[PDB]
């Protein structure tokens, strides 16, 4: 069975931080990037954090520039997103997913592979 488990979320104050990780299993987690991306109702989906299978490259959206990191540990299985500095714009749900290296998605069964997504809610 094919997952990548998600964790973390809550509700914090501005400046707060939280760190969301997620677990891969039933596929080989250090082949494939990662991401986190969010979604809030009212506002479109967005990619905040991309990690490559090693590691070695990561991005993020210029709005969490120096306040998230996304790392990885190939050993845990899991890729982990560190929010800090938390902002009321941050409000969302966040998944992780797996995709490819030019995608979020993997390429055939990509729900396999899509964090449940957990609620990230900074107060304003």
């Known amino acids: 069975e094919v997952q990548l488990v998600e964790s973390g979320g809550g509700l914090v104050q501005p400046g707060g931080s939280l760190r969301l990780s997620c677990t891969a299993s039933?596929?080989?987690?250090?082949?494939?990037?990662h991401r986190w991306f969010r979604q809030a109702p009212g506002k479109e989906r967005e990619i905040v954090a991309v990690?490559?299978?090693?590691?070695?490259?990561?991005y993020y959206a210029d709005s969490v520039k120096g306040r998230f990191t996304i790392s990885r540990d190939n050993a845990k299985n899991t890729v982990y997103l560190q929010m800090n500095s938390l902002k009321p714009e941050d409000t969302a749900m966040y998944y992780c997913?797996?995709?490819?290296?030019?995608?979020?998605?993997?390429?055939?069964?990509?729900?396999?592979?899509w964090g449940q997504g957990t609620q990230v809610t900074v107060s304003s």
């Open positions: 997913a797996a995709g490819t290296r030019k995608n979020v998605w993997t390429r055939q069964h990509p729900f396999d592979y």
């Open positions: 039933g596929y080989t987690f250090s082949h494939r990037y």
């Open positions: 990690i490559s299978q090693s590691g070695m490259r990561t």
